[PDB]
Amino acid sequence: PPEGFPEPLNPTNFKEELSKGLHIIDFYSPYCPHCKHLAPVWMETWEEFKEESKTLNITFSQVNCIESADLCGDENIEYFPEIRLYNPSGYIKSFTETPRTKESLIAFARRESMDPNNLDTDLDSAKSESQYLEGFDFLELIAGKATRPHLVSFWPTKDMKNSDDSLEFKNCDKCHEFQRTWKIISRQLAVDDINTGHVNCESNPTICEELGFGDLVKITNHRADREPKVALVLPNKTSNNLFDYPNGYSAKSDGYVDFARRTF
């Protein structure tokens, strides 16, 4: 066991400990097949994360649900082991991604530190990582020239230089909300070395029409409302390398990040 490795949180510690910063907690059981296959991974995770832990305000913790059974009942633990993110307000989300490695847990903590809503930090202080793609740039990506995956967003505008520029979108109720979402997505995907890009569909009509985003190219009074679109570009493939975002619109970044991270 690593030197400073902390004891599980218990009913004397839980609320006092979660009242500052972020916590990634392993609700585990000493009575579990898979949870002793997590334990040594956890401690190495903890050990390698010691430095960033200080600077990102994120702590890896544990709860033994046998020694704290009523604690785990309050937190409504359904399975073992269960990995969760808390902030000072309480539960946020679970980390179900498999298989659990030191790499995957570290990436997840880094990913979550860049969500401004988690510690209500200020997104304006940060740059958007989203890259301005002219039509030609986007076509190069799709010709198989990407060396990393690119989540690309498409907009009913011609004036977006940075994805967070102040812009007035016509017949697009969700466009402004999605600029916040897109910026958060760009920074979270940057940890996984997945690129992001934005396309001005008004300046790239033929490309956006061919791709099925033709409704973003032009004002029409038959469609009341339009939404920004998102698609994934796979690196170093010359065909079938373009995949539209499958789920519905969301104000949350999570669906888009996890889509961009899928193995295809």
Add this chain to the structure above:
Amino acid sequence: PPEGFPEPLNPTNFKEELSKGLHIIDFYSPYCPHCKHLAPVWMETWEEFKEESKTLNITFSQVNCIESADLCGDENIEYFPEIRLYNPSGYIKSFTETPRTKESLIAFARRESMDPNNLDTDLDSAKSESQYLEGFDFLELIAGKATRPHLVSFWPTKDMKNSDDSLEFKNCDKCHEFQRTWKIISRQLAVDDINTGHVNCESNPTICEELGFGDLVKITNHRADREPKVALVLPNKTSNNLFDYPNGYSAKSDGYVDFARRTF
């Protein structure tokens, strides 16, 4: 009570009554508000439905959850009242639509009589109600000349004259499947006097491209797969009259049927 009005089903009747045809059952309690403002409406529904009940093989029934509390318990009745569609194989779906009127309930039975999957009847014996729309025809609907709502389907082909013609769709995994679905949709919506149409996007490149369906127009090597698109045209409106089907793909007709029927 109407003259022939059957009394509620009981444990001596239930499984035996449901072994043939379709049943639309009102699981109620004699001591609850919504189930006593429903009660006379059911009797309205039943008596008006007598002639169709036999030719459509659908029965309106009721269950007193006091005299048959264990029945309602076995079927997992959660609320009162609960209106449900049953098969000889068992539960199919619930009728949550409000307000419950004699018109809405009759419409539902007629609609459900037209799902081939309910009684394993043969869809191939029926005409598709879907009408062939040229691009020009569709713009006329969208200029405000629709006198009824039109749910329209858009396809990556040019050869679709009847929506259920024998066709080979290229790079479209779901298309064959959705012909069955689109055909059922056209028939169920004919009950509510809602029209349906199909468009050959290959015969209509500019229209489908501008509509945001440009991927159906043409083969490209970057998209593995395309799927047919669905849009609703509101009748007699000259603007904001075109609304895309919002949810994801389904092989079930129901979301598409309900989207086409909801108030805008």
Add this chain to the structure above:
Amino acid sequence: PPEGFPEPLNPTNFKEELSKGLHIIDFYSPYCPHCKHLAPVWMETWEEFKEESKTLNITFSQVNCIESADLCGDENIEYFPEIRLYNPSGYIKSFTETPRTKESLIAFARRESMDPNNLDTDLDSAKSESQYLEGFDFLELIAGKATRPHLVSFWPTKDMKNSDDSLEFKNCDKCHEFQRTWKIISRQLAVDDINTGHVNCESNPTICEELGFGDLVKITNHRADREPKVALVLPNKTSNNLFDYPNGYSAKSDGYVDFARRTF
């Protein structure tokens, strides 16, 4: 007579004058009814055309067939007056249209200046005036929404965006040839403010089938060869506004132009 108005050409200046550019010559007799009610219209024209004469390299000239009788004899003048188009190479055609006005004469030179064969200029340098019509565009024209006449060409292909694009036509020996003809037609008719358009029948199967161009819609092994079809659409009429080109196929643009220019 207008100020700079030239004297008739005579045998000493005649062939060296026609040795450059295009010439429109009025072979007349001073003792002729129709040849002296042409005279002032000829002077109106010349003066009105002064500015265009320089940039188009077209000259209105005259020959007195009594004072240069051996000249008119060499050219085999049949009647008086006879209006002829010459290039440096010699005679080209006569202008038989009546009634002769300043407008008709101006139009004629402008029309002839865009025939590439007159002064062997190269058509590749020019835009085609023929506009791309999809099915909906064409049906709008025929529903009566055209405000000028439209001569329309119909083709066995789906790949024609500009009427002069590089294309490989299947089972159509004349199509490549007719592309030049059609381009010259579009530019000559543009002088008379008549529009021209082209239709891809492979992209508009049902519209073209209904119109009687079904042989262009699809490859078949019954027909060895197909040719492009030509039809005229009259402006501002809601019925009986479509007229097929009546004469045979020609590599010449003029039969097609003159058809498009008829009074209805």
Add this chain to the structure above:
Amino acid sequence: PPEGFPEPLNPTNFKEELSKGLHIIDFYSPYCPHCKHLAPVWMETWEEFKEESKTLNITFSQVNCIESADLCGDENIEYFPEIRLYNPSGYIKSFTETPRTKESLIAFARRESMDPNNLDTDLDSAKSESQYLEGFDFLELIAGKATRPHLVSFWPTKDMKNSDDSLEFKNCDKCHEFQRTWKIISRQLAVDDINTGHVNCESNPTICEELGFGDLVKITNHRADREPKVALVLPNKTSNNLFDYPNGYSAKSDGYVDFARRTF
């Protein structure tokens, strides 16, 4: 605004529109004093130029540098407004002349249509406008009997009847080239009703010696090389009516045309 008046060119159509013919483009800003008295002159220019536009392959167009700020940065726009000539290969020259009227803009288009280098047309098909002036004729011009200005060229030869005759010039490396230049000058000045003339200095030794072109009069081994000289004759003036072309030799016609057009 006139009926068919085109909208400004933008980054999506700009390079496509310029791929054919000549374009005279008004690069403007809506927040520019000078660019708002041009706007109505521009729309007038366009409307009266509609007919010649077709036959000369010359189009008036615009780019708003507020709505197309990056295009104008790519085009290196320095001031507003900036009127420019483009061919398919790109920028040619700017139109800096003031004050801009409908007449000056039209005249400029006609002049540019007669430059063989702009659309690479064939100058040999056209006549030279340059008139043969014997010594006496030129002395008449200079006595003030010219009724239009006369740009006159002086040549080391005795054999020039037409300025584009096939000739061997002695000790004049540039003479052949300048025959092309002088021919272009003659046709372009013909648009503005400025005459051109040519003089054989070998046939007119005293006039040519006296004007300072004595070097063109006879073969001498003092000078390696001689060049044809150019002078302007002002109309209806009896003195100070003779002006040497002030700048250096050019194979380009533009300087000679502009000097001949200067008001004194």
